[PDB]
Amino acid sequence: LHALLRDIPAPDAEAMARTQQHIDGLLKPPGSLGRLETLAVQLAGMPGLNGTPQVGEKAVLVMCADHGVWDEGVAVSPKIVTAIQAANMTRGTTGVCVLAAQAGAKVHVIDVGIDAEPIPGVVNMRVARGCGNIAVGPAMSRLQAEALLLEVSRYTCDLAQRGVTLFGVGELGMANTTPAAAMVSVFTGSDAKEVVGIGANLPPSRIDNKVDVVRRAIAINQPNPRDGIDVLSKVGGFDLVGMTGVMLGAARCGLPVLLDGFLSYSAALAACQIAPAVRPYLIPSHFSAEKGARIALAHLSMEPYLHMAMRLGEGSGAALAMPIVEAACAMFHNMGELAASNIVLP
Amino acid sequence: LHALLRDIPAPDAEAMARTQQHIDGLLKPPGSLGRLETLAVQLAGMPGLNGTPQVGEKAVLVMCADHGVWDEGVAVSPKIVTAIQAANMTRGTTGVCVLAAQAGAKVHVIDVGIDAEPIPGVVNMRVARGCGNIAVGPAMSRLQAEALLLEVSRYTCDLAQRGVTLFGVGELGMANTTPAAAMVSVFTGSDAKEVVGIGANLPPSRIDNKVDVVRRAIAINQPNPRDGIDVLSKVGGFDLVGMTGVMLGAARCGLPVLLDGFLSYSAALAACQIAPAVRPYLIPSHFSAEKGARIALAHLSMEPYLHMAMRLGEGSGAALAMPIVEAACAMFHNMGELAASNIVLP
Ligand SMILES: c1ccc2[nH]cnc2c1
Ligand SMILES: c1ccc2[nH]cnc2c1
Structure with a gap:
């Protein structure tokens, strides 16, 4: 590594x-x-x-994983949706699949930690069935984060050998806007209240609890802002780690990678902390409707090309921007x- | 009409x-x-x-014309560039041609008033060799504006019979950001200084003269803000009229039309003044880098999807947005x- x-x-x-x-x-x-x-x-x-x-071949890598913090009531989408949607990714009926098809890109679905049985057709790189509940402890061990970073990095630069010259990153994981907010807060030094959004339509009344969960995770884990891998392993998730891995791999490969929304901004913050040399390879796509988007982007010194008020994730924004690169x-x-x-x- | x-x-x-x-x-x-x-x-x-x-077939209509106000020293691009670029449009080497080709759209080049000999391959609808110098009088007669509006409107809705379901509008005319600014000032009631930009790289020192020219045109012509055709004929141009005609035609045809930059915002302001029913058919593309863009868009209550800091014109932004509609x-x-x-x- x-x-x-x-x-x-x-x-x-x-x-x-x-x-x-x-x-x-x-x-x-x-x-x-x-x-x-x-x-x-x-x-x-x-x-x-x-x-x-x-631009030769194009690929969008979607990292899928479940989060223990879902039990804290920070997401209204059933936990099983991660697994159901992961499967739908294999049938091309999801948002990213439809938009990637429009851009002539291929979608690679990768399971890095879904809390369900293995899904046929999905690339298997699962670390465990869901990561730890960041509210009471770390999401994973440092060793697990480093191992996944390398695994995903290798897979990514390996695709470069198949003609892929442009990557897009995406994710799938119920409740992942919570660890995303935690990471953004830690890296930018912003208060949790300023970066916690409603994610997948979380009721306005349940927002307070989400902000509290974010603060507890940071307080209990004490992630080091100067150590990108420490932050990822403590208050991140398997999907977040995977996204960071795609960025490190594309950079190593000397190839461009299109960001997506808020989840991807969190991973980019970590990637650039781990290796500033990654920055020149990142390309923004759209400006996420998530509350902490403005803050995250300012710290990455990035200005997205598309203002679509999108907040679906999956790498849908990355796919929508591919035509712009071409x-x-x-x-x-x-x-x-x-x-x-x-x-x-x- | x-x-x-x-x-x-x-x-x-x-x-x-x-x-x-x-x-x-x-x-x-x-x-x-x-x-x-x-x-x-x-x-x-x-x-x-x-x-x-x-979305069926796509077409971008580029209205080309010359302006008498060019003699006022408001543009640094040689006047002959209009005619040279119009010809290049027929060979597919221009910005719009390249981007339209990428979107799978066909470019229709229309001469509504180029001050040069007819160009083979270009659709001939010229009113005269360049419009009048708006600084000392009107650009054209009301009859000439109404006649062109109808001609372009018919041509536009006629394409709908050929399978075209999505239109894009563009222009080509040296010095046309001057009449564009005049129109925006009149329709929005903003001072000329607030809407006059550098257009095609006008030196910062020559800006003052451009602002003065805009005010003189308005003072001398006294265009009626409540009469879109009065404004177009007095302080507009043949190209501006043509763009307005495309919008009226697409609307009559019940079809969508993608705007481009500042020049197109001016024409849209006129179109909506002439017939408010046109508004539901307009789709913004990008946010022009021209100074008066923010003002014009606010009055059209439009928020572009693309922030590319583009200011080339020709309908290049419209073409870039077609993939978004699809x-x-x-x-x-x-x-x-x-x-x-x-x-x-x-
Ligand atoms: C519910 C349904 C589809 C989704 N895609 C990403 N998150 C989702 C939640
Ligand atoms: C100079 C060269 C090309 C152009 N396309 C539109 N305006 C121009 C000026």
Whole structure:
């Protein structure tokens, strides 16, 4: 694992400079395509893309797991929904499946800790049947977190060998907005009340209890904000760990990864704490409707492209943004040049 | 023309109600897909879509024209760029062409007033070689504006007969951000200084002159804010009129139209003033980086889905948003249902 973090490549400034120059000469007023231009340049600097903004195969990895904190009454969705939805992911009827299909991406469903019998068709990487209740103790041991990080990281960069050049991350786990809020609070130093949302339609009256649960988890576990793995193992979850693993793996592979919503922002905070070198590889997708989204994004210094007031999760936002990444590549490679049209601008 | 405005259909509340009910039962927490759900419902209410959110063929109409106000030194792009770019539109090397191709849409280039010889391949609907300099008089006569509105409206709804169900609007015209600002100022009652931007990279020092030009145009012409056609003919342009015509035509046809940037917001303000019934058919795309974007959008009560800091125009933003509209349709038709998975939520 120390080798993994050590070997994450820095961005290629040389390719980025060549990219910027090419974009400047395209058929349009310099800088007029805004964030589409900066995105293209960002892509060009990723070693796994061979010096140019390009998109080959696309995949969305959905990490599924159950949480012991569900027993604290922080979620109104039945716990069994995690397992039922995981199965639906194999039949292509879920939100992410439908949107990924639209973007031409393949969905990989991974079980990292569902509290149910194994589901045929789902990639098995389960650590245990649900993680520990963070309200009374740690979600898992440090060893379990490190082991999963490596496992998911390897699987991720392995897909790169199959032609995948663009990743999207997602999750599935009832009650996971609680550990997500805990992590955001710890990493950003914000009070729990400022980052606890209603998740999957939690009644406004049950919010108080959720905030209390978040504080108890932090108080009881005392996670170290400077240790991303300590935070993940103490107040995170198997799914959160898995998402962080995808980011570390894509980064090691020198490839881009599209974030999704609030759950993914929490995992990105951890990933960047563990290895700041991961940051240049992350691409935001949408601006989650979850209460603590603004805070999490500010700390990641990210501004999403899409404002859809979405809060489904599953990696649905990541899939919705894939066309945008392809659009930046199309602009770069297919637009004509000013010089060719004898157009000269100041 | 009075028949055109009179015959714009109201939205189908019955289909919208059936649409909402169906979306509520999909495999996800109610309302979790946010604006994707509201967009799907909006689409369902458009008569031309046959009671359901669907997208058939897509087309982006780019209105091209030159402006006499260019002589006032309000634009740094050579005037001939309008004609050169119009031609490039026929070869698919422009920004809109590349992005439309990515969305599977066809680009229709229409010359409504380019100050140059006719360009082969471009749809000819030119009123004159450039409109009048709005700084010293009106851009055109009321009769010329009404005639073009009808011509473009007919062409637009005619495409609906060819299978087109989704329109995008764009423009091409050096210096057109000046008349655009004038119109926005008049319709919103905002001071020119608050809505005049740098357009196609106008130097910060030349901004003052642009603001003065806008005020002179309004003072000299005295356009009536309550008369959308009066404003268009006095301080607008042929391209602006054409864009308004596409919106009136799509609305008459009961079909959706995706806006683009600031130029298109100005035209939408006029369209809705002329016929409020047009509003339910307009769909925003991105949030333009032009200074007066926030003001224009607030008056249209619109919140764009994309924040790309784009300011190229041509209808590039409209094309970039088409995948989003198709995504709302995919969600509606392809997602599974909660009842089928025995999932019951509060
Ligand atoms: C210069 C070059 C290309 C353009 N497309 C729209 N306005 C332009 C100005
Ligand atoms: C209920 C139904 C579908 C879901 N997908 C993600 N969380 C869910 C809760």
